Design a protein around this ligand. Structure first.
Ligand SMILES: Nc1ncnc2c1ncn2[C@@H]1O[C@H](COP(=O)(O)OP(=O)(O)O)[C@@H](O)[C@H]1O
Ligand code: BEF
Ligand SMILES: [Mg+2]
Lengths: 65, 615, 49
């Protein structure tokens, strides 16, 4: 009987691996690893990880000007 | 734009609104829309006068995109420079443009056309006895050219190596130069009697390309762009046959040279005696007064060291004054040094043949002053619907890289990162299922892979033949012939070596696993292997082109950037997120974690004469 | 060389017609596009082992 407020992030291994590096750089990102498709993250960093991840993925996307 | 009220939504547009001008009463008939700022021209393919402008627009405007209904052209200095050559003056362009335009031509557009359309046709370059003379038909030009700081009826000599300098200078100065050869009145150069045999059939587009070149009556040096497999070889063959003078052919391959010669004899009536082949195997040169030499640029652009047999050949090429030079695959002549053959080899006319007139650097524009402007271009989809070329069901398979490999992808450096996601297990399983499914359908499959290590691993794992740089000419030729007519061998594993200029009339399916980063030409060149399929007219036939790319990787950046040219031509890639029936396949490579772990480490680990008896 | 002839009766004529029909269907299948190219496969689960 114990409750822990947080955000349940559901994603694929590719996104999961990216989140780990973000968690590695910023420890507070991930609170606990639930499963290969479920991660617990701090609510405060949700607005930042989603926005920060966009810049990282921008490199993999070819935008013609 | 005077006393025109902007619309409430005009703020969204930025200096591009063209509603200030009014439409003519005959809009229902005129097919052309002209952009007064960007120079883009939108052509109606479903309205009267569409055909009359389809060919004219290509000459004056470079085609950007030509989809089914609405074609998109654009007028530029290079495009106008190509049109101004073939008997076209500024008045003709403006008169035709206004006649076919729903809207009046703006002053700004006119000013741009006036500046560059009057330059062509005042200075001529001629060659005599291997000596280059800058000939002008008026004496006024002497006060201009001779007084130029860079430089140094009247005709004066000029250094052969200095042609590339003056020609570029000629572009900067008002008057550019034109390379016209009056072969009719040229009797000093020996002639060769060769004509196309009766079995030959000139296709309608081939005749149109020739007409644009011989419209005025004097041969013009330039570039011809045709779809891969459309017959760019025959284009060069026709030019040599009609000129009827000494000619030299450069082909950037060894297999191509062998097949170029075989097709050369088949289509024309040239006797084998007068035809000579200059490749690594044999280097003998024809002793006849007039003959043809088919070689590769690497065999003529070398400067430091050459063989004794090749040393005489180099002098043999340089000493004689050739009449025509055919630059096969002219997309590589503006490279570092292959352009030397154009200068060292003396020729009164130069021609360029390439399907893709694009490259990463800006040297593509150098072709304008190297061999001339672009003469004719042909659509891809238009020939597809006419039965000239086969239809392709282009596809792009997104294979999500496995988690174990993806972890190393993040940490690994860029140089080693490429090999990691090219050998992911998912690609192996997808390829196996597709190969078995397509093999059951009686289709010939070609698997391209720029990485030699991946090619060998895939080939040995699947027990199929593979060809790459180390493969000798003899062995590969046997493999190619076997793959064409042998039913047992239905698939092969080619590499960057076979990316272009190899004739595969039987190939129908094409797959690629690796790539040479963002090049947009290799994608088109590779696709050309299946565009010349023999059974391209049977009802319902559609070729296949599969691109295996790892998802959530840099491959998408290169994949979306390396297929932009084909999209412009008309090909459309279809995303395949799922391959149905993959699970039901009996066995798949690296299906268990144990094999994946073993592969992970394997790829990761990749980075006194009497004393003579003594020994 | 050897010359072989075959006299076709009414039953054979109809029998031969069906052979071509089967061949035509196979010929059409040889040119028909694969199933996955027929329908857009986005909602379906992603490809995998
Ligand atoms: N007029 C033609 N008649 C028959 N086959 C032709 C004709 N023009 C081209 N081909 C065939 O097209 C194929 C490709 O020719 P090739 O000159 O290698 O094309 P490209 O250089 O444009 O890639 C060859 O099989 C060639 O025989
Ligand atoms: F465009 Be081809 F294949 F030389
Ligand atoms: Mg070719």
């Amino acid at each position: 009987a114990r409750a822990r407020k947080g955000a349940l992030v559901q994603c694929d291994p590719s996104i999961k691996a990216l989140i780990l590096q973000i968690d590695a750089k910023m420890s507070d990102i991930v609170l606990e690893e639930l499963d290969d498709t479920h991660l617990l993250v701090n609510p405060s960093k949700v607005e930042f990880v989603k926005h920060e991840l966009n810049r990282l993925l921008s490199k993999n996307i070819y935008n013609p000007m | 734009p005077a006393d025109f009220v902007p619309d409430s939504v005009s703020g969204m547009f930025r200096s591009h609104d063209f509603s200030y001008l009014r439409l003519r009463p005959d809009h229902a008939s005129r097919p052309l829309w002209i952009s007064p700022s960007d120079g883009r021209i939108i052509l109606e393919s479903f309205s009267p006068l569409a055909e009359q402008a389809q060919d004219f627009l290509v000459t004056i405007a470079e085609p950007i995109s030509r989809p089914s209904h609405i074609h998109e052209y654009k007028i530029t200095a290079y495009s106008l420079y190509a049109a101004v050559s073939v008997g076209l003056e500024t008045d003709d362009i403006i008169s035709v443009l206004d006649r076919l335009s729903k809207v009046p031509v703006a002053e700004s557009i006119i000013n741009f056309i006036k500046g560059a359309t009057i330059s062509y046709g005042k200075v001529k370059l001629v060659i005599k006895h291997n000596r280059y003379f800058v000939e002008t038909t008026q004496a006024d030009i002497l006060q201009m050219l001779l007084n130029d700081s860079v430089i140094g009826v009247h005709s004066f000599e000029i250094a052969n190596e200095s042609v590339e300098v003056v020609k570029k200078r000629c572009q900067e100065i008002d008057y550019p130069v034109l390379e016209e050869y009056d072969f009719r009145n040229d009797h000093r150069n020996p002639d060769l009697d060769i004509d196309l045999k009766p079995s030959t059939q000139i296709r309608p587009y081939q005749e149109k390309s020739l007409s644009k070149m011989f419209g005025n009556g004097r041969a013009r040096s330039g570039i011809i762009v045709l779809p891969c497999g459309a017959g760019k070889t025959l284009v060069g063959i026709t030019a040599a046959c009609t000129i009827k003078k000494s000619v030299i052919v450069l082909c950037t391959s060894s297999v191509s040279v062998m097949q170029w010669r075989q097709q050369f004899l088949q289509w024309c009536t040239l006797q084998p005696e007068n035809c000579a082949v200059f490749t690594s195997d044999n280097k003998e040169m024809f002793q006849t007064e007039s003959g043809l030499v088919v070689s590769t640029y690497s065999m003529v652009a070398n400067t430091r060291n050459r063989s004794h047999d090749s040393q005489k050949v180099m002098d043999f090429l340089t000493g004689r004054e050739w009449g025509f030079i055919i630059l096969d695959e002219v997309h590589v002549v503006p490279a570092a040094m292959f352009r030397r053959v154009v200068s060292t080899i003396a020729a009164h006319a130069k021609l360029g043949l390439t399907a893709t007139l694009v490259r990463e650097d800006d040297k593509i524009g150098d072709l304008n002053f190297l061999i001339g402007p672009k003469l004719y271009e042909a659509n891809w989809m238009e020939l597809s619907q006419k039965g000239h070329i086969a239809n392709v069901q282009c596809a792009e398979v997104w294979c999500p890289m496995t988690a174990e490999f993806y972890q190393e992808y993040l940490r690994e450096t860029a140089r080693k990162r490429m090999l990691l996601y090219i050998m992911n297990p998912t690609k192996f399983q997808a390829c196996q299922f597709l190969i078995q499914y397509h093999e059951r359908r009686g289709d010939k499959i070609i698997v391209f892979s720029d990485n030699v290590y991946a090619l060998q691993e895939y080939a040995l794992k699947m027990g199929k033949p593979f060809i790459y740089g180390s493969t000798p000419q003899q062995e590969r030729m046997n493999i190619l012939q076997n793959f064409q007519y042998n039913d047992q061998i239905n698939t092969i594993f080619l590499s960057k070596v076979g990316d272009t200029s190899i004739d595969l009339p039987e190939a129908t399916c094409l797959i690629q696993i690796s790539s040479h980063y963002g090049s947009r030409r290799q994608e088109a060149q590779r696709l050309g292997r299946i565009l010349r399929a023999k059974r391209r007219n049977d009802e319902g036939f559609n070729a296949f082109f599969y691109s295996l790319v790892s998802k959530d990787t840099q491959e998408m950046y290169y994949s979306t950037k390396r297929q932009a040219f084909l999209v412009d031509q008309g090909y459309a890639f279809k995303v395949i997120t799922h391959l149905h029936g993959m699970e039901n396949i009996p066995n798949l490579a690296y299906a268990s974690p144990r094999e994946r772990r073993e592969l992970l480490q394997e790829v990761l680990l990749k980075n006194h004469p009497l004393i003579r008896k003594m020994y | 060389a050897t010359l072989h002839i075959n006299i076709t009766t009414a039953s054979d004529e109809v029998a031969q017609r069906e052979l071509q029909e089967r061949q035509a269907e196979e010929k059409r299948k040889q040119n028909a596009v694969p199933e996955w190219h027929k329908q857009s496969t986005i909602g379906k689960t992603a490809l995998g082992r």
